[PDB]
């Protein structure tokens, strides 16, 4: 699994290319990936290639299987000339030789911002991920930190980027990375940040249900929530506790292992947890959460109304064992008033 | 704290015309309360005297300081007949001024004051805000209609004042929504009775849920210990009222003048700095103290999912190594 | 610490007359202590010198730093037999003065003395005073009668200052009491070791029952908190006495002297106060204190019993909703 | 369910006419309870209408069915007086115009307090709560608070307070209120309270007794006796749980259910836990408080003789949790000796 | 079962000859427990009869069915003198007036300490006893502490000296008494008491692999190790508990049951708890305890394979929570920092 | 941090004379890592590219700082070809002068240098002093024979060095340790790696074992509190380490300079005292708390025996009483 890393001397000019192929509809084919990755290593690390050979992503897609080659020429201006010559690339090479103008280097970050905001809805599919990204990016017009060029909000440039950013493991990992880690940061970083914070167990919203609401970690013990402890949802939490612990080994990358397709994904499907997804949504819905799902539909509203009905018990006997430390309270005042009487 | 109950045979016709003063904006004085409860009792006990004398609503009202007077005129056909004569005069006046309709019509009006119960206590503007939010929300379901008339902003000020200044008709409607005849004006006095808990006792709220859990929150107990202390005494106060505590602020119940987050400001101010950090009322001198609280809390929520996952993690690395042990302990050796 | 054993054929007729000599006020000196304990040979190891050379009983004897010494005069029929011949002389005249009877009269004797164990550490009034309403029970259930003449303060008198100087005594009847030829001469010294236990340790008894849960009571918290300590330290030292230690005031175990309500004068005060507010000895600059402990228990039991109500009612209105729960999501929709 | 209130000016000569009839045995039929109301209403109230109404009897005695309705006639001064004409009170007025002196003020509040003996042992019936009011006549008779008339203290004199006791809700619940929420308080009071404080459980000593020695709360959950861990008595003990929590509804005056005949009671009777009776009155027993119970005697036999032999061992245990506690003080403070030495 | 004083003024010439015939192999005979009860009560007691029988000694020792009945000599010199005539004790006259020196008072403690190198392998038998006590000399004589004289080094006399030992529960019990009840005490005392700490549940390993690994006590409750929870295992703890409680009465003294053959000792032997030993070894060697052991050899060997990887995931959680604390900490002090800022 | 890997086709051959280089005392300088590399990528992954970028060990040998740099030379047939051409000069003069003899001697090779890894931070001599004796231990069990002039003194002295200035040989070995083509070799190395954990960390151990239960021993409570939290900061640094942080020592990973005991001195010296105590480096102010923390622990060590054992006697005391209640329950009375 080789992918190409361009390295020239007028990089910012040959990456603006690579963006203006992308957005013209030009299909990269088995360019693609090298030609995103020359984006993001010319953003964060300035084609320093020493730079990045040391940097986390770089080790963590060689982790991956990923082995880099560079294409040195830096006597080079234009994306055509670091593409290798062959009838293959040929077809490529004659869609560059048509269709925009010189850009600023801002562009390069402004794509790459524009691409994170598809990422919270990306695993949903084409509609989703597209519908929130034009939420989003009127969040960030109106907070006038950034405006997006009108010719990039078309259905037809948008479902470019959506498929752009799917098949580009690369591309994804990269700004999910970066948004976990952001560090002393442009506010390219913080649109980045934002939308890699949304993208959390994107996919994986029975994790999120069951850890937020069914579990809990204490001193010491994981504690079930009284609904689930019975015999049949009891097995569910146990294959849900062995799959959640296999996503672990992905470390701060395990919300988005359904984003980043990493091992052990299969079984973490809310199909494999029928009673415990059931009672989890009960439980989410009573607080006020989120909602596809009738088969399982009266195990949802009768984990819905039981724990309305449970949380109005906690906070009744929260209140009355506050006031019975009180009454205490005064008893041994009235001592103390007594006893030095 | 006398308040006056109608007993006629034209019970509907009569609480028509209490409803047809209150929307013209008719000043009903002192004879408000009991022009409300008759509502309330024809709608839950179809002015059946003997049924409400022992319910649970008449026992609360009497506990918190009302004595029922009826006036028995079964001789009456509209409201003026029941009122009494003595010269007061200017409300006997006003009602010179129209139709019955339905008995329905005493619920869809009991269930549109209770709209404006969640934020009742945060006043005029965001209570009406509130009811007309779940306007949308009841007519989307189709479950209710109301009157286009009605929500207009000089009738739903009307309305808010009514229900703000009668402790029976905020009562009543909290009472029948935490005990749930299950029609769609229960499920709609339910849902707003709901969201009144804690309206206007947002500290309390955020510090049971947040703060004390009884260790406390980290927060807390570096920065304070003895404005627990306080605060543990002012909440005691409301525990006499029972089911009915979340309610205390609206309700105005015995005891809510020893909840000022004067005696607490700092713990005020950390628990709204948590609160918001979960996603969530004024300060100065300790604003910089709810933003600290928020930014910790962000970090500590942020910590707390990791030791979770990493928690289920080490407990199903120990059930490997158990399983390991049972299959391990049984191989046959020769 | 030589006590003497006397070993002959006439064992029953030399030890009625031991018992004829005490009833009679003959004082035995110094050969009181192997008197008394040749009647609990006689009586629990029938004068088998070997079976009880090897028993529990001789055992902790030995340990408390007593050593046997047997007399052996097989050809005795008398008491005065196997008295030493070293003129001492005025126990030896006073003799010459009564049946034998039986055998039975053996444990009759020894069960009457365990009556006065449970006030034994009071004094002379409030032992013979349970002794005499212990013979009411015991001889209304027909188990046992006393003879009338034993009934009489000068005889009560004299069992009394018996038993209270005869550690010999006093520790067989307790040792057989604990752990329990199962006659009712063993039920009656059993009952009577049984109500024993804390004689003149009454502040040990409220302060592990009611002080110590180890939590603090509340009334120990606030006050005292190193008087706890130098009760737990005095307290320690009876520990090494075993099954034993409730019976050290009685038995004058070695370290009773450690505990002196001197070293935790509030603590004792304080105990006093929750046992009597349970239904149950003396201080002047602590008496308010004991006052205030006894009014303030009764608020506090008063409290635990509706909190122990309370907290069963909300336990089963928890299992209502996990109850409803169960049947609600078995409902079959359409 | 109406009862009936004279209110006229000469209060407490009507009243003590109402006693009179009372003690010389004239059957009030269906005007006693409104004869006895009067009398608490004159004792607490001063027959200030407006007073009583707004007092927490009134409010807890409408709450249970009642309605009043005042009879005025301030003119009058004999119970006679206030008696509507019909010949089916005539016989009553008949037995009126038969049979004492005009008596004090104090007489009213001597009459109920002398009712209140009967309260500890009213739900048993005619011959102990007689021989209870007599032990407590002596008690109070002795502290010298109260004397009594001899002619009150006859067999049938006493046998005519227990019927009319009996028959009384208003005259039982009057007594038990103002014996619960005692102020700041004559020593009529404080007789009707120590009455009232001897009646808590009346009636209900299994639920005092497994209370007391069978369960108990903790910080948290409510624990139970060992004896009672076992498969046959835990069903009994969820039952009495169900049941107790019934009673709890009634609040301060659930201990009074029974004398009261609150709603609840025939699901706390003892026969519906046999097993769990014999076990808590055996603990009971083991610590000295109370005796009708042989099926189950070996139960409660060998549950006596278990709990001394438990006690005793909590007993010895706790004494040597101290010593080793000390023994690890001694060690430290070697310790801190041995540090600088 | 009475046993021989012997009381001269000769004593301490009395005693060594009765060290030098047990040393030169002469068979004593039903003499040979109060020769050496003699020996004790000479080297601890000063032959002071009184001093004696006021001891704990003396008090336990007819606690187990032992009466002593002294033998008054003083005017006799030679062990001769104090044997009673009799054609039965003629053939001990006989080797006595046949076969060494008069020695110093040091040598009966001197033999007294040998004898107790035999107590830490006693119960296993002649080889493993002998084979420790020659490996506990050299460690004494190489501290120079004591030096033993080499005719008492051979096979031919250690063999002699075991057989004693192994016979004489006296001398048994003499010696672990005194070792365990030093006081403020020479360094005969010092090798006594270094002895019978080895000899700690010599014969009753299953119980102290079952007390270091298997059970642990806590504030409140004796914890399983977690291997062992399992059915068929937990009966044998069960009976493991009981056998272990049974030899409590003993005190001090339980842990030298098997050395004392004290009542109770036949319920604890390694082979009525074959799982629960196999586990508790698999346990002791994984931390490099103590090893005669194949029909429970991978049940051992599975049990230290877990026990490795249990203790290593143990340390590792125990890192990580202290870490998480100190994560807190940083929080809470950005918390002060950021208050007044 | 550049190092090389060395590709050719003769691989064996330029592995042996990597081993025969390091064997006879020739300093590879600045290459050493790398040949030492080398090693470890054909013992492991039989000298697969591929299959080694993405492995465990070259992500976190990449995470440590690594990045590796091949040298494809096909040609090759000897270690001399692969070395750059570069006049460094110094080391490619002295190869001119050692057989290949099989691929089962590189592993002979790596699983001699574990064999220093569980005293190296002591040593020069300790860690030769147990390589010593575990070459008895595993020569006995003959899974392996080491050759006789790889154990003299100058040879081993050799290797120590080696493997103390090479992180890369040193995380290999512990990295297939931890985590187990399972032969001896291997076995070899796991119980090496094993032997090393806390090795240079005997503070951390004895502390995280006996000090920290998270409740603390007795003898740290009243002596110190702050000390705790020093050490609890200190450690929290190798935390990142995850598995690895018990040889953070050993390999000197980030953040072992905060462990210096001038720190927690007190703890230190008594965490000693109490590792001795169950039978197991320096200080002068602090050797007497050191004797005294070893004597407490001794003795508490000794109570708690006592306390366990005494504990299961109550346990079947209570036992015996609710087995003797279902037994007597059930008594048949008449």
């Given at each position: ?13 040959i990456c603006n ?148 950013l799917r098949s ?66 009891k097995n569910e ?105």
């Open positions: 699994k080789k992918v190409i890393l361009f390295d020239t001397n007028h990089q910012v000019s290319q690579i963006i203006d192929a992308i957005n013209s509809g030009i299909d990269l084919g088995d360019l693609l990936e090298g030609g995103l990755l020359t984006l993001c290593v010319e953003h964060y690390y300035n084609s320093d290639k020493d730079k990045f050979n040391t940097s986390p992503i770089a080790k963590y897609l060689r982790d991956a299987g990923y082995e880099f080659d560079v294409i040195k020429n830096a006597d080079a201006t234009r994306f055509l000339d670091v593409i290798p010559n062959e009838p293959h690339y040929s077809p490529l090479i004659l869609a560059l030789k048509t269709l925009s103008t010189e850009s600023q280097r801002g562009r390069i970050g402004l794509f790459l911002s524009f691409c994170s905001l598809f990422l919270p809805k990306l695993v949903v599919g084409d509609r989703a991920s597209i519908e929130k990204a034009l939420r989003q990016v009127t969040v960030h017009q109106e907070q006038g930190i950034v405006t997006y060029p009108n010719h990039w909000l078309t259905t037809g440039h948008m479902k470019v980027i959506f498929g752009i580009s493991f690369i591309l994804k990992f990269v700004l999910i990375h970066q948004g976990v880690n952001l560090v002393t940061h442009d506010a390219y970083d913080s649109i980045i940040s934002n939308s890699v914070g949304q993208t959390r167990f994107s996919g994986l919203l029975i994790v999120k249900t069951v850890l937020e609401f069914i579990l809990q970690k204490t001193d010491s013990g994981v504690t079930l929530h009284p609904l689930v402890r019975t015999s049949k949802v939490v146990a294959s849900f506790k062995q799959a959640l612990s296999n996503l672990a080994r992905h470390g701060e990358y395990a919300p988005f292992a359904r984003v980043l397709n990493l091992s052990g994904i299969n079984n973490l499907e809310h199909g494999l947890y029928p009673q415990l997804s059931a009672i989890a949504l009960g439980v989410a819905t009573a607080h006020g959460s989120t909602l596809v799902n009738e088969q399982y539909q009266q195990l949802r509203e009768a984990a819905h109304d039981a724990e309305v009905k449970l949380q109005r018990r906690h906070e009744h006997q929260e209140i009355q064992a506050i006031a019975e430390d009180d009454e205490e309270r005064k008893i041994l005042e009235q001592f103390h008033l007594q006893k030095t009487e």
